[PDB]
Write a protein that binds this DNA or RNA. Structure first.
Lengths: 123, 123
DNA sequence: CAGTCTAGACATA
DNA sequence: TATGTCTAGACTGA
């Protein structure tokens, strides 16, 4: 369904339990977005690659990490790495685009995980 | 240390990840008991097998289950099975000894996990 | 800066 | 009842 499709745009790089984990990671995002009705703005953004899409938002946690499968990480890094930069090392190689209100660095209650609202800085 | 020792009195039956699990299971118990100074009454009860030892208590949870390693279970069953009856199927083949105030069935804030305050009923 | 652990939250059966 | 799965929050570090 939506998951298999979204996965289509860069299933998951790394040999092994990684493809399965990438699937789990898409599943979490999709489950949460359904609840808030943003699954389609996600669908648009990944496919059309339109930087000026609405902010696809997920709730933040005290420490700001997200756990999928076992694996703990920053929301926006997990997804920019999934659909844009599989090379992405950390949240330092990233920076929002002013047009993102909930751009993580703003410590808001929601976090924009729309991969097209961040640009990768080579520092 | 204390864990390697207490483990000694029935390390852990089942082939495999079990022996490692039984070790995790004793580590949980020992960690909690240290915080409340009951590790020695545990030490005494397991070694001396004295039924009339103090009630070794662990805090109960809403559902009353305890999770060790992944594996969910009832406190008193996981421990009676560890140093008494490895055959123990469920919490029905068990019953307190009147002398245990926090004998689980009493739905108190604490749960007596002293394996020598329960007796196995063959129903 | 990051890896482990588990009660409590679900969601059935 | 009874039971399995998933993770935010806590804890542990070095």
């Amino acid at each position: 369904p939506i998951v298999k499709r979204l996965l289509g745009w860069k299933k998951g790089e790394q040999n092994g339990q990684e493809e399965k984990w990438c699937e789990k990671a898409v599943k979490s995002l999709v489950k949460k977005l359904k609840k808030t009705g943003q699954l389609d703005e996600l669908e648009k953004a990944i496919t059309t690659q339109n930087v000026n899409t609405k902010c696809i938002t997920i709730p933040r946690s005290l420490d700001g990490r997200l756990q999928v499968s076992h694996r703990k990480g920053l929301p926006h890094v997990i997804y920019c790495r999934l659909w844009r930069w599989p090379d992405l090392h950390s949240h330092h190689e990233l920076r929002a685009m002013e047009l993102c209100e909930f751009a993580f660095n703003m410590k808001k209650d929601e976090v924009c995980v729309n991969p097209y609202h961040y640009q990768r800085v080579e520092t």
